[PDB]
Amino acid sequence: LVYDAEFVGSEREFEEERETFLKGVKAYDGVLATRYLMERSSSAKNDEELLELHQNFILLTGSYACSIDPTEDRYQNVIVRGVNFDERVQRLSTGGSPARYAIVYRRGWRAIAKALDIDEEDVPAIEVRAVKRNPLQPALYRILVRYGRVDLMPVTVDEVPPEMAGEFERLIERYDVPIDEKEERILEILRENPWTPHDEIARRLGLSVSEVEGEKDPESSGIYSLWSRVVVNIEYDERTAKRHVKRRDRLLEELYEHLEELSERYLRHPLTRRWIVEHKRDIMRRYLEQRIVECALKLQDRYGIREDVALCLARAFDGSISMIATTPYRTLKDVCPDLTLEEAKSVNRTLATLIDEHGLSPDAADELIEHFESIAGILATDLEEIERMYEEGRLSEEAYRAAVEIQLAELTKKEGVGRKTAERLLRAFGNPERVKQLAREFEIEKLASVEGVGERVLRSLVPGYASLISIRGIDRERAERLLKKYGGYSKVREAGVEELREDGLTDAQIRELKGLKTLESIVGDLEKADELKRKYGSASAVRRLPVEELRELGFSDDEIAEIKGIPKKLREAFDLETAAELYERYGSLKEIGRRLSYDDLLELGATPKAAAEIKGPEFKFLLNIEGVGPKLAERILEAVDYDLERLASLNPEELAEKVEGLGEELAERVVYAARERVESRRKSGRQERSEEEWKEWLERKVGEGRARRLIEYFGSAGEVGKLVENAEVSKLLEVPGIGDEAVARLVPGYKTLRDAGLTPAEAERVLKRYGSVSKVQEGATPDELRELGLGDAKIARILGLRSLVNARLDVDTAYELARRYGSVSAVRAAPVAELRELGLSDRAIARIAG
Amino acid sequence: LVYDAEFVGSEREFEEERETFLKGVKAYDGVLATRYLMERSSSAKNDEELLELHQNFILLTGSYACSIDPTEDRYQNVIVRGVNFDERVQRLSTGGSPARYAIVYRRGWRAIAKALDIDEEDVPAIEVRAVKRNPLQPALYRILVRYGRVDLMPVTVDEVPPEMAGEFERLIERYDVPIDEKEERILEILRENPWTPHDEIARRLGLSVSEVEGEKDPESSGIYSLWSRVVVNIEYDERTAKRHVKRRDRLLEELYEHLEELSERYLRHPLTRRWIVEHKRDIMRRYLEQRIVECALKLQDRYGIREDVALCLARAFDGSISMIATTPYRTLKDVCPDLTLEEAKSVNRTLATLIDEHGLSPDAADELIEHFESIAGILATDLEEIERMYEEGRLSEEAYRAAVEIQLAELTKKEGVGRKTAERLLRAFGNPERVKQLAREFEIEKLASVEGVGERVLRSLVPGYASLISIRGIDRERAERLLKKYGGYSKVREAGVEELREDGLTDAQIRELKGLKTLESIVGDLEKADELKRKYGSASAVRRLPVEELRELGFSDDEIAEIKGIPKKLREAFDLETAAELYERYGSLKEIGRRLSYDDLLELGATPKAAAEIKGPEFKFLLNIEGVGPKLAERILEAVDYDLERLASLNPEELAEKVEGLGEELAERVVYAARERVESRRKSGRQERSEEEWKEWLERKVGEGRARRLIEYFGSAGEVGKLVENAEVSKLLEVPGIGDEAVARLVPGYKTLRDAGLTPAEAERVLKRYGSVSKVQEGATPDELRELGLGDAKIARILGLRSLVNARLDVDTAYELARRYGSVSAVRAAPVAELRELGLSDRAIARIAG
DNA sequence: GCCTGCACGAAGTAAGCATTGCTTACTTCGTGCAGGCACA
DNA sequence: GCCTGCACGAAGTAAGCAATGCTTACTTCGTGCAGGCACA
Ligand SMILES: [K+]
Ligand SMILES: [K+]
Ligand SMILES: [K+]
Ligand SMILES: [K+]
């Protein structure tokens, strides 16, 4: 039953006892490991050195057991299986230590281990009840242990006196002591074999085992009493005690080396301390007591129960956590009076839910627990059953109301399900779990038969019904049929086009269902689109495929140029390989004709006309007057960095200053033509919205009502437009009726900044500082945004550095890896050594790779 | 604005108009595809045959447009951009058809397409406003279209009379008709180029475009009026009309072939009708009006709104569904007076939530929508803001109550969060979304600072806090530190052992966290266990590894035998390869010595003694009496199928009948020894629990209280035990205070059958029919369970056929694939041809592989 | 709305990661019988 | 509780799939201007 012991001593004595007990545990672990070696290999069983090691481990276990509680006061209230060993020792003539008198019994260590707070996970087992294969006399061994005779306990099999083993009688006659008839009858049987089991001595005599053994005290009758009378009359040798205490530690650490030697000899692998601990756990977890300890540990760790209360609960409920969690509070108090209400709430989650989340008294919670066991039990019980139990007076008012509210809460948490509809569903189908199961079974018509179960209720209840009913032409019964046939929306989406056509679905319905509109725009065949979705997934992944892989899949060159979005002037000037490479390396044809040289364009296979077309439209315009020459027009555009306004700006004399090989006669004509062009250009886009145009634009953006509300609030549409152009988010929001889904509709980029976690004021500051979200992404530095009051998390989120910061990198280093490289994928596949060059640890680079 | 038209005709006329409009749509699709070919490749643009094909498509589009509304009565109330074209045609002298007079305008088809219910998804575009590259005279073309002159509209570019194109004046002078001064001023410009744009004619004359065009009626001034006066004075040729009607269909289906030919010539790929529709959509979805149609279609399909109401909503709110979902009901009623309240609830999910789930009037719901836009908007707003708005009278009582209840419900749905604690959290942190964000940020101390936020609340709120706090020795602050450092419980679990040790975690804590207890039992090193978890995953996968792979990883042979659980009698008799193969092929040494022959065991390298030990314990007993011979003992055991009771049962004379080579003298001794052994066996296990033993067993299983409760409900603990042995689940459950988590504790196998979806009565029947769940799995057939009243779904669940039925296979075929094979993995990797042998489709086999 | 392609900006949309919920042997846990590792 | 290894049964536990929720450019959507497809 109860194993308990309380340590009442100083910190010094506490450390002494902990060290002694841990060393004894190591000794008994050596015992068990030697037994495992004996049984694991018959070749090891043949070895006599292994038997000597086993006996030496037994001797050291006994020696360490003798050193426990030397002052006879470190332990009190020692209990072993309900038996109070304190009063049992007090009733003995020679008194002694209750701790040592407890360890000599089976599993007595469980008491002492609780007094010293030794981690019960590693099974701190110490047993000194060896009979067969014991180097000493068993009863003498146990008596020496219980009397704490560290001087008489040998520390080596070679130092074992024959008067303590085979010739034990020589030690008895040396100290006289009276011997009664029962003890002589036991001794005349032990003379045949001193290691005879006490069961055999009791059977070959007609006595009980308790009669043969007797109390471990001189004033008794039995072999224990005889050895007690013999040992009491022996003086305490201080010299041998000190020398054994000094020797035994090195002796144990040497026996472990011998054990590892024998394990290497017979198993070719060692026996780790961790392995020995795990083996002890796995060989002793079979019996309850170990399951009780494991359950009490689980309670202490997960629910924070005190040690003694958790142990008592585990004893009372066979170490079953679920059993304790389905037990009412009054029963838990009956079995454990020291249990607190908070502890019971922590263990019984149903009790805590009722009491705290529903304001029930512990007695009403006990009512609900006794009648329905758990919250899931309540959710399983029909509503009519609870109503009947309430109307018959078998269920209190508060308990009934709380149970009904729990059942209703399980259904009202779905969108569209009110309380009247939840009650109707509970009346029609009994319990919320039955409703959930009917929803899983796609019983759409059965649920729709209930009053108030509309489209919203079905879409919130039946998984995937929304996705199918929203398709044009798919009826409710058709959606139910599809869901029941294929088994969920996922399996209907994974169905092939042929079997979907056999069911009567339109090709448009199948396209909408499988999401193939983009691949239908790419390839005019539905089956090939579905097969591409199967093989690669998204249409973007097909667009990212190399040219060679696309050619093999059955694509023409024009189809590849259309898929990758290659411009006409770029797809006609070069072949697919070079055009696609230039496009996926520079992005825009403008960048192609601005970063590459005219000679470079020609060398790649471009017609001079095509190469001029690839060059900017100003390049085609420079050569359209007096033939300034491509070699010279390219340098002219490289000066102003491809800008007609920069060309029309400066004085002609500055041209020959910047561009070499340019005469000043052509410079004036260049500037004149550039000014003419910039005057002809700024005459088309010279537009500022009028009043009516601003009014119509507002009505289009935020709708009629909010538009006229804003117009009245700020005066005219012009003021609203001025606020929009200046990104006056705060001024727009103060109007009642204008929210984020309207400001973001008016101010481009507001929604993205809001989804990044920025407050409207912060987003307003950012928009005023940088102009738009794009300019923020390709321009803002973390310190810059830190000056605007943004936290590092918001900065990382808005700059696109989420993946890099997820690798446990700060925002500054992530922005540097984005600056000195390219995108995130550019750092994902990066020179592993160059990252170490930048001062990143190997662990940081490994996390970058992950 | 509004595009609308109502069809007022017979079913025959309806089909006629649908066919005519679809043919015109195909013609205009050909027009657009020819333009795409002209623009896509300059080589195709150089081709004159492609230009002739384009002009032929234009002519056929015009011819089909002339055939719309022939009886002049099929359409009424034709509206194009708010302009009612019915009254506009009625005010003209020559009257005519409103449909044709609408089609000649930009996007006029949108009206007629709504009258004929043509699928607007495919963009039924019909335009006859071609100027450049028009084979006829543009104004003459449009007038012929508006007057429905199918006879005068040519069907081939070669059939174009010069008096209708370049020499158009010849057709004018042929019919006299007065010409005013403005029309002569337009004609003297058209004599230069008949295809001059009307914008150019208005600019090079000083008039407006409407002044140059004029009304399409004789009583007007303009080129339209001139051509109207010319065309009205021409008789309708019935012969040419009939002949064009007969030709145009074949002509169009031939022009499509010419288009495919040119596309193969210039693109090496064809133009599918689906591709053409998708390209038309992608080039016309850019303009607003098409977005309006797409939004109205989305409304009709997803929310079941009537066509006209959805169209009006899409027009009024720029085709944005989100704007409509954030628009109050009164505004929607203002823009659409015909809108019903149910439609508004279906489109605005927040409105529906408020009205139905909270019983608010439409005005209170509109209040909440205006102030917070959405339910998520309410969840984002601080509670103090709503309190201020209510106390200032700017928020009605009902709206404030509903908002507070929404905010509170967002937190009470988490276990451990009551209402007082939810209110305290909302006061401390403003809004529930802020609380969720603080929980994601692992701000555990900040949340714990609020009164009533205990361990359960934190575990329900902070993701992964439960997994870390439940570990022995990990404090709350330590768990917060780990979660903030690595970023979630997953990243703490993915952390290496080295960095976890650097953080101060015990090796036991790291083992508990990373789940390496089994791999710690296998390998006594934590780092190697972690590396094995990284490489292979689960310890069972390492156990399943072949012997050679285990040897290379650094395992000894004894370590491998321990990993795979090889018995001693099996690991010592053979080598590692053969022993491991026999164990992974037969599972138990009993099955080894039962399925294999004694000679087969000897041939594999087993000692006769070891081979007898591998044989069943009865094999060692038959040879222990009179030396019956292994060759004969094997047949004796093969007769009774390895059963001592079957041997002791029958008469000795039946032995020589079954086993050949057996004398009748040995048969009597065999039966005698078998009866002696079976009598000596049933004398040790002959145990049936007494009353006190049943009481103690009940107290152990279901606890003291429920045990005495059951004892009081029935006669004695013996009756409870009798009910348990017979699996009387129903009679045990009827006891008040006994639930599923106690019956399942009493009746082994009940929990598994319940988790399979079986009712207590069904689980009771199954347990009574088969004895235990194991016997059900390895013995019950689907038809048998169907006889017991179980549905096929429950049968699939209980028999382990979930994976096979998920492949859209019925329970019978899945059970057959489990019978005629092995496990589910045996069907996963199966002969693909042998599955076709059993009558499975290729799709079924493909799903089996997946 | 001339007619769209090239091009850019960015959230509208929806791919993709993460979390959460359900199912089941996927793995761990509890029990019993022989006979050795060895008795209250 | 002799002692534990072999072995089976099964839910206790927790791997593994499924659905749901969050974040963000991941993929589409909306807009503008150039110059041709080519004009109220
Ligand atoms: K803890
Ligand atoms: K529908
Ligand atoms: K506001
Ligand atoms: K009950």
Residue nearest to nucleotide C10 (CA to C1'): A749
Q: How far is the CA of A522 from the C1' of D28 (A)?
A: 14
What would the CATH number be for the domain defined by B3-137+238-284? 1.10.8.1010
Nearest residue to A518 via CA among A536, A502, A500: A536
> Which nucleotide's C1' is closest to A747 (Cα)?
C10
Segment (H or E) for B203: helix B198-203
Contact A556 B349 (CB under 8 A): no
Distance CA A828, CA A845 (A): 9
Contact A269 B556 (CB under 8 A): yes
Asked if residues A664 and A653 have their Cβ atoms less than 8 Å apart, the reply is yes
Say what the resolution is, in angstroms: 3.2
What tokens appear for A34 in the block?
Answer: 């030697």
Q: Is the dihedral of CA A405, A410, A413, A418 positive or negative?
A: negative
Closest in A356, A523, A843 to B418, CB measured = A356
| Helical axes B432-440 vs B420-429, angle rounded to 10° | 80
What tokens appear for B551 in the block?
Answer: 């040897």
What tokens appear for A496 in the block?
Answer: 């092939």
- Per-residue b or e along A696-735, where b marks 16 or more CB atoms closer than 10 Å to that residue's CB: ebbbbbbbbbbbebbbeebeebbbbbebbeebbbebbbeb
Please provide residue B624's backbone torsions phi and psi, each rounded to the nearest 5 degrees: -85, 5
* Integer angstrom CA distances of residue B603 from B576, B582, B593, B627: 16, 14, 14, 22
Distance of CA B119 to the CA centre of its chain: 26
Residue nearest to nucleotide C9 (CA to C1'): A774
What tokens appear for A722 in the block?
Answer: 């001025």
Distance CA B173, CA B768 (A): 106
* Integer angstrom CA distances of residue A174 from A152, A177, A543: 15, 9, 101
Distance CA A605, CA A582 (A): 13
Degrees to nearest 5, angle at CA B271 with B267 and B275 = 125
SS3 label, residue A79? strand
Beta strands in A383-503 (DSSP E): none
> Secondary structure of chain B: what % helix, strand, coil (to 5)?
65, 0, 35
Residue written as token pair 């401390």: B428
Segment (H or E) for A787: helix A782-787
Distance CA A463, CA B1 (A): 39
Closest in B377, B421, B470 to A301, CB measured = B470
Please provide residue A39's backbone torsions phi and psi, each rounded to the nearest 5 degrees: -85, -25
Closest in B270, B373, B704 to A316, CB measured = B704
β-pair partners for A7: A75
Distance of CA B348 to the CA centre of its chain: 24
**Breaks after residues in chain B, judged by C–N over 2.5 Å:** none
> What strand order describes the sheet that includes A3-7?
A3-7, A75-80, A83-84
The one-character DSSP state at B523 is S
> From ligand 1's centre to the CA of B476, what distance in Å?
8
Residue written as token pair 């689907």: B782
Chain B residue with minimum CA distance to A43: B572
Do the annotations mark residue A510 as ligand-binding? no
**Breaks after residues in chain A, judged by C–N over 2.5 Å:** none
| Portion 246-275 of A in contact with B at CB < 8 A | 267-275
Distance CA B655, CA B671 (A): 9
β-pair partners for B849: none
Do the annotations mark residue A444 as ligand-binding? no
A323 part of contact set with chain B, CB < 8 Å? yes
B806 part of contact set with chain A, CB < 8 Å? yes
Residue A16 — left, alpha, or beta (φ > 0 → left; ψ -120 to 50 → alpha)? alpha
What tokens appear for A568 in the block?
Answer: 């006409």
Asked if residues A116 and A18 have their Cβ atoms less than 8 Å apart, the reply is yes
Distance CA B837, CA B817 (A): 12
Minimal CA separation from B753 to chain A, in Å: 16
Asked if residues B134 and B195 have their Cβ atoms less than 8 Å apart, the reply is yes
| CA end-to-end distance (rounded Å), chain A | 53
Distance CA B623, CA A275 (A): 41
* Integer angstrom CA distances of residue B89 from B68, B85, B126, B234, B829: 16, 6, 20, 20, 74
Residues of A in contact with B702 (CB under 8 A): 323
Q: State the alpha helices, DSSP H only, in A238-302.
A: 238-267, 273-284, 290-298
Asked if residues B101 and B85 have their Cβ atoms less than 8 Å apart, the reply is yes
Question: What single letter denotes the amino acid at residue A636?
Answer: I
| Helical axes B397-412 vs B383-391, angle rounded to 10° | 170
Distance CA B532, CA A567 (A): 52
> Does residue B604 lie within 7 Å of nucleic acid chain D, judged by its CB?
no
Radius of gyration of chain A (CA): 45
Spans of all domains in chain A: 3-284, 495-544, 558-681, 800-850
Task: Considering only the C-alpha atoms of chain B, give the largest distance between any 2 of them, rounded to a whole number of Å.
Answer: 141
What tokens appear for B245 in the block?
Answer: 């009607």
Residue A837 — left, alpha, or beta (φ > 0 → left; ψ -120 to 50 → alpha)? alpha
Strands B75-80 and B83-84: antiparallel
Residue B176 — left, alpha, or beta (φ > 0 → left; ψ -120 to 50 → alpha)? left
Distance CA A216, CA A225 (A): 5
Nearest residue to A594 via CA among A569, A619, A573: A619
SS3 for A341-356, per residue? HHHHHHHCHHHHHHHH
SS3 label, residue B3? strand
Please state the length of chain A: 850
> From ligand 2's centre to the CA of B301, what distance in Å?
5
Q: Is the dihedral of CA B24, B25, B28, B29 positive or negative?
A: negative
Asked if residues A26 and A105 have their Cβ atoms less than 8 Å apart, the reply is no
Q: How was this structure determined?
A: X-ray
Distance CA B831, CA B290 (A): 54
What tokens appear for A768 in the block?
Answer: 């005023």
Q: State the alpha helices, DSSP H only, in A470-615.
A: 476-482, 489-493, 497-502, 507-514, 517-522, 526-535, 539-543, 547-552, 557-563, 568-571, 576-586, 589-595, 598-603, 608-614
Residues of A in contact with B415 (CB under 8 A): 349, 353, 357
Distance CA B584, CA B582 (A): 6
Closest in B282, B317, B413 to A703, CB measured = B317
The one-character DSSP state at A615 is B
Distance of CA B209 to the CA centre of its chain: 55
Asked if residues A201 and A191 have their Cβ atoms less than 8 Å apart, the reply is no
Nearest residue to A589 via CA among A564, A616, A609: A616
A467 part of contact set with chain B, CB < 8 Å? no
> From ligand 2's centre to the CA of B302, what distance in Å?
7
Contact B736 A418 (CB under 8 A): no
Beta strands in B531-686 (DSSP E): none
Q: How far is the CA of B487 from the C1' of D20 (A)?
A: 22
Please provide residue A58's backbone torsions phi and psi, each rounded to the nearest 5 degrees: -65, -45
Degrees to nearest 5, angle at CA B507 with B503 and B513 = 80
Nearest residue to B534 via CA among B487, B485, B489, B493: B493
| CA end-to-end distance (rounded Å), chain B | 52
Q: How far is the CA of B617 from the C1' of D7 (A)?
A: 14
Q: State the alpha helices, DSSP H only, in A11-137.
A: 11-40, 42-46, 48-66, 85-90, 98-103, 109-115
